[PDB]
Amino acid sequence: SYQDLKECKIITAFITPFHEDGSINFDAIPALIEHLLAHHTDGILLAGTTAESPTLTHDEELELFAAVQKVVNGRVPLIAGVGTNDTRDSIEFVKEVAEFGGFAAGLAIVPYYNKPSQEGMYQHFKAIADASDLPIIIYNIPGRVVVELTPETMLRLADHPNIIGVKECTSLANMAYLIEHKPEEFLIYTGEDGDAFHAMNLGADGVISVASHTNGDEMHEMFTAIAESDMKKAAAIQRKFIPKVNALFSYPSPAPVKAILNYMGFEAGPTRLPLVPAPEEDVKRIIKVVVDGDYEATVTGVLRPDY
Amino acid sequence: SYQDLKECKIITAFITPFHEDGSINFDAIPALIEHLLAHHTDGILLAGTTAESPTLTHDEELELFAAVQKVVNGRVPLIAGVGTNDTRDSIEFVKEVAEFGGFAAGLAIVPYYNKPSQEGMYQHFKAIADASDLPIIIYNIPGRVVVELTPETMLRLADHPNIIGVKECTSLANMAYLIEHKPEEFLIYTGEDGDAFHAMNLGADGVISVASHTNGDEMHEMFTAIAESDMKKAAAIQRKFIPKVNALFSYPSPAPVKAILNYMGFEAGPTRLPLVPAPEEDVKRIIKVVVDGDYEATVTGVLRPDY
Amino acid sequence: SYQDLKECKIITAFITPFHEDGSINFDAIPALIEHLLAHHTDGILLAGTTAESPTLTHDEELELFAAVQKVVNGRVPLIAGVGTNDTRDSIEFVKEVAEFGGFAAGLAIVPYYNKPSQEGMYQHFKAIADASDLPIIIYNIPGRVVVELTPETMLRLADHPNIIGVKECTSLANMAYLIEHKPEEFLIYTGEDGDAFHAMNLGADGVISVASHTNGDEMHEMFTAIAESDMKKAAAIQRKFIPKVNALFSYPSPAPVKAILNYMGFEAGPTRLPLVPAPEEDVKRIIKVVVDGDYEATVTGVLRPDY
Amino acid sequence: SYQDLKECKIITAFITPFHEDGSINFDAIPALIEHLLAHHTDGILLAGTTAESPTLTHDEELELFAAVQKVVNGRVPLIAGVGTNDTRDSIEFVKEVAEFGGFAAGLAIVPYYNKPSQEGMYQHFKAIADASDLPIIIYNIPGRVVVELTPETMLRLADHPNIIGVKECTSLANMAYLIEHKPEEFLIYTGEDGDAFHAMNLGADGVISVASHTNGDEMHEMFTAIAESDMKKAAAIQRKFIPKVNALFSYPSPAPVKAILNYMGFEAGPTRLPLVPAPEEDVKRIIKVVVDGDYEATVTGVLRPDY
Ligand SMILES: N[C@@H](CCCC[NH3+])C(=O)O
Ligand SMILES: N[C@@H](CCCC[NH3+])C(=O)O
Ligand SMILES: N[C@@H](CCCC[NH3+])C(=O)O
Ligand SMILES: N[C@@H](CCCC[NH3+])C(=O)O
Ligand code: NA
Ligand code: NA
Ligand code: NA
Numbered sequence A, B, C, D: 001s002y003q004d005l006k007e008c009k010i011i012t013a014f015i016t017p018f019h020e021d022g023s024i025n026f027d028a029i030p031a032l033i034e035h036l037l038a039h040h041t042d043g044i045l046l047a048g049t050t051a052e053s054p055t056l057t058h059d060e061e062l063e064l065f066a067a068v069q070k071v072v073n074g075r076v077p078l079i080a081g082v083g084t085n086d087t088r089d090s091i092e093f094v095k096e097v098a099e100f101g102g103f104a105a106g107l108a109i110v111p112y113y114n115k116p117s118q119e120g121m122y123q124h125f126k127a128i129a130d131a132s133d134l135p136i137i138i139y140n141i142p143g144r145v146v147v148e149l150t151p152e153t154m155l156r157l158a159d160h161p162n163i164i165g166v167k168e169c170t171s172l173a174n175m176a177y178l179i180e181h182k183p184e185e186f187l188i189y190t191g192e193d194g195d196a197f198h199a200m201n202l203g204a205d206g207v208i209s210v211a212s213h214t215n216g217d218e219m220h221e222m223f224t225a226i227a228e229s230d231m232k233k234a235a236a237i238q239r240k241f242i243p244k245v246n247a248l249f250s251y252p253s254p255a256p257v258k259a260i261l262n263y264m265g266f267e268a269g270p271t272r273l274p275l276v277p278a279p280e281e282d283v284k285r286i287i288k289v290v291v292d293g294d295y296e297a298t299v300t301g302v303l304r305p306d307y
C-alpha cells in the first residue's frame, strides 16, 4: 500500500545472483540482503531492470520473491516487478503476485519494443491496475523503451485508486511538474541515481536505486544532509557521487554493479545473455571509481539451464 | 537457406489478424495471404514486429506458422520470427521452429529493453545461430530497441555459416558499408519502406515491408523501374510513396495498416494491448493518403483470452 | 574583475529596445534599467543573445554600453558581450571595449556556424583573453551553436589568469563537474533560468537570466530561500517557475520577453529581422503564464536603418 | 539567373587560400580554379561555409569575387555567399554584389545563432530576395545553424520570382518532397556529398560540393553512370565514396580538404581562427582515405592581419 512505502527514501533495485552454470544463486541472497539492510536500503524492488528480469521466467521471479521474503521478514517493504510489454501477461502475473502476497506494490514498465501510443499506455496500465489487490507503480524510462508517458497521461493514471506511484526516468522538468500536480497518496521516485540529489531537493519521495548496492552510506549521508538543511554537505557529496554513478553505467547495467559486488565478495556472479560481464579492463577502473578498491587478476554471459 | 531467399525483393512482415475477443482470427489468414501473393509479395516474414509478436505466445506463433504454411503451400519462402531479448528463450524457440520445419530462415532482433553491449549482442546471436538447422537473419532496429549492432559486429556475425542476412533499419550510410563488405551467402534487406528506393539503388537485396500489405503493386512498379533502368519512373513513384509510408506509421504500427486492411474488407481486426487501434479521425486520413479511399465512420485494445 | 562579479546572483542579459523604424530606442533604456535594479538584478550583461547582438553593429553596441553606464552609474557591475564567431573581429572589439572601460568582464560565446574543434575553441578563447585588460567569461551553449566546450577544455581555459568565468548551458552533470574542479578566481553561472534552482543547490555562483526582466522578485525569493535553508519554499517557487520559463522561450527569445515588457509599458518594441515579434495568439498566453496578466489585443520584424 | 545555373551538376564551394600570416593568398587562386575546371567543376560557389566566410570581411569577399571572376572569365557560372544572420547586413551586401555583377545567384543561409521562427526566416529571405537584381538560393543546414526551414516555408519562398534554388542539407525525405512540389525555375541541390548519389536518383539538380575539390573525377563518373543508366557502376562508386566524404569531415571542414590540397601542392594554407588545421596524425589518415596518397613529415590557426 501507499502507507507501506510512504517513508521509503532509498529503494534498492535488487540484482539477481547467478551461478556460473546460469541458474539463480539463492545461497548468495541472504548475505546481499543483509548488506543492503546494513547500508540504508529502506525498501527493495525485486525483478526490476537491475535484476535482469528480461532473462528471468515468471516462475523464477516467484522463487526469488519467496527467497527474499524469507530473509527480509517484513523488515522493509517490497515492490515486485510484474509488468512486461504484453498486457495479458502482465495481468496474469500481477494476479499471481497479489495472490502470493507480501508485496507493498507491483512495478509495471512502459511497454518496450512495441512503442504504444499514450492511449495504449493508458489502457495497458489501467488493465494491470484493475487486475488485482496489489497497487501499481508506473516505470517511465524512454532511455530503455524509446516511448514515454507524457505527464498528462501519467496524472490521468495517478487518479486510479490502485496506482500509487511512479519511478520516473525522464527530465527534472517533468519531475517538477509531477510533484506539483500529483494527486493524494501517490509517490514520485526518480530511477536516476545521478539525479537523486536534484529530485529530492525538488520534493520527490526517494530513489529507486542501483548505486545503493555499493554506495548506500554516502547516498544516506546526502539525503540526511538535504533533510537537515546542510545543502553544502549534500552538494559536495553529489558532485563526487556523479562519476561513481557514471562508472556503474559505463558498461550495460548490472554488469558494473555485479563486478563490484563480486569484488566485495558477495558472489553476484555473471550476467545472463544477452548481457555479458564487464571486461577486466573496465572492472579495474569501475572498482577504483565507485568504491576506491584496488582490483587484481574475453567475457562470458550465461544461460538459464535448459534441463 | 540463402538460396531460398536469394531472389526475394518484397518480403511482407505479415500482420496477425485478431478476433474482437482477442483470440487469433485464423479464418481471415487465407484471404490475406492470397491478397499478398496477388500483389507481388515474394516472401513472407511471420511473427515480426508487424505481427504484434510481443503480444503473442510462442505456442500461438507455432499455430500461426502452421496456418500460413497450409495456405502458402510452398509458393513463396517463409521467415519465422524466433528472437526475443532472452537468449535462452530464443535458443529454445528456434530449436522448436527448426523441428517444425518449412522455413527458409529465422529472424532474431537485437535485444530490446536490456540494452546489451556489442559483445553481448555477438554472443546472443552466435548462440541462436549455433542452436539449430535454421539459418538466421539479424534484425537491427535502434528505433525500437535503442541499441544497435555496429557494421563491424554485424560483419563479424555475417561470417557465421548459419547467419545469412540482415534486416537493417539504421541509415543508408550503414547500408552502403554493409553492401560493400558483405561476405558471400549474405542478404541485405532494408526494414524501412521509405528507404526501399535508395537501398535498392545502393545494391540491397530487397525490403522486408509493412507497406506491401496495401501498396504492393506500386512498390513492384518502382522496383521493376529500378531493374529496367527507368530511374525517372522509379523516382516519381518514390516521391509519391513517402507520404504513404508516413501515414502507415502516423499511429503506432500495425494500427494504421490494420485500419486500411479492415477498410479493404480483410478482417485484420483490432490490435492487442498495449497497442490500441488507430483513432477514427486518423483512420479516414490514413486511408485517403495510403490507398486513396473514402472511409465512412474511443478505441479498444484487446487481450489474449485467459481461458 | 572576478572581485567585481563575485557576489552577483542574478545577472540580467539586457534586451535592446528598438523603435518601430528599427533604430535603437535609447529613450526606453533608463526606465528598463531602473526596473531591473528595483527587482533584484545585481549585475547586467550587455550585448548578449537576449540583446539581439547578432543584429547589432559593434558601433551600436558601444553606443548601448555608453547609454547603460550613464544610467547604471556604477551601482551594479556590467558585463560586455564581445565575442563573435570570428577570432580577429573578437580581438579587435574586446580591445575597443577594454579601452572604453567601465566593464567587470567580457562575454565570449563558443563560435557559431563554423563549428570549431576543441583546439579551435581553445586558441579562439586564448587569443581573446590575451588581447586586453578585460577578463573573459566563456559562454557555452550547444543549443545555439551546435558544438560545445568539453569540461576538460573549459578547465584548461579556466587556468588562464584573464579567464574568470563561464555561462554554462549544457547539463547539470557538467555543471557539477565544473563546480567540483574549478580553479580559484573562477565563476560558474548557469545561462538557463529553468536550471537556476538546481544549479544554485549544486554550488553555482548564480544565473545570467532572461526571466529576471519580468520575474526578478520570485527568482530572488527562491534564491533567498536556498540561502536561508528553506528548501521547501525554494522547491515550491521552482515548480511554479518552470512553466513561466517555458513560456518565455515558447517563441524565439527575446520575442516573448519583449511582448511582456511592452505589456508592462516599457517600450521594448519589436525585434530586428531575422527575428519577428511573437504572434498575437501567443502574446496573450505568454503574458497570462509569465506575469498573470490580462492582455487586450501578421507580425513585422524590423531593420537597422540604412541611413 | 536560373538559366545560367540550369545545367550545373557539380558546383564547388571554393575554399579561401590563406597565407601563413593570415592574409588571403590570391596568388594560389588561379591554380586551384584551373584544377577545379579540369576536374568537372561546372559551377563555383564563393564565400560559402567551405570558404570560411565567417572569418572573411565583406570587403575581402568582394576582393575574392574579383580575383576569381578574372580567372574564371565566364567559363562557368558563379554563386556568391551574401547572407548572414543579420537581415540588414545581408540586404546591403547582396546590393553590393548585384552592383558588382558577374554572379548567377546569391546564396543566403538560414540565420545562425539567433534561431528565428519560420515567419522570421520568411521575412529574412523575402527581404534579401526583394533587395537586388541578383536571384537567391536558400541554404538550409540545421547541422550548422540548429533551426531549419520546413518544406512548407521553403516552397512559399520558392514562389518568389527572385528565389531560384535551395542548397538542402536535411533529409532525403525532405529532398523528395521539394523535388515533387517544386515550382518552375527552381533548382534543388544537395549540400551533402555523401547524399549526392541518392539526391540525383531522387531527381535533384546537382550537388554543392566540398569533395569536388579532391574527388571531382569519381563524382562525375558516378553522375555520368546515373545519367547513362549504369546504376551498378554508380552504386559501386558511391559505396567507396562515403568513407572519403567521412574523412573530409573527420575534423572541422575545411581543415581536411585544405590538408589534402596542401599535399597536392595547391597552397591552400592554414585555416583562420577559430578554425585550426587538422592535426598531423589526422592529416596522414585523411590523405590516405580520400586520395590514396602517402603523407610524410600542435597546430596553429591564423588571424586576418590587424594592420
Ligand atoms: N524476456 C521477456 C519475458 C519476461 C518475463 C518476465 N521476467 C521480456 O523481456 O518481456
Ligand atoms: N512479450 C515478451 C515475450 C514474447 C514471446 C514471443 N512472442 C517479449 O516481447 O519479449
Ligand atoms: N551578425 C554577425 C556580426 C555581429 C556583430 C557584433 N554584434 C554575427 O552574428 O556574427
Ligand atoms: N563573422 C560574422 C560576419 C560575416 C561577414 C561576412 N563574411 C558572421 O559569421 O556572421
Ligand atoms: Na492513484
Ligand atoms: Na554467414
Ligand atoms: Na582563470
Ligand code: NA
Pocket (backbone or CB within 6 Å): D157, D158, D159, D160, D161, D162, D163, D164, D183, D185, D186
Ligand atoms: Na522562385
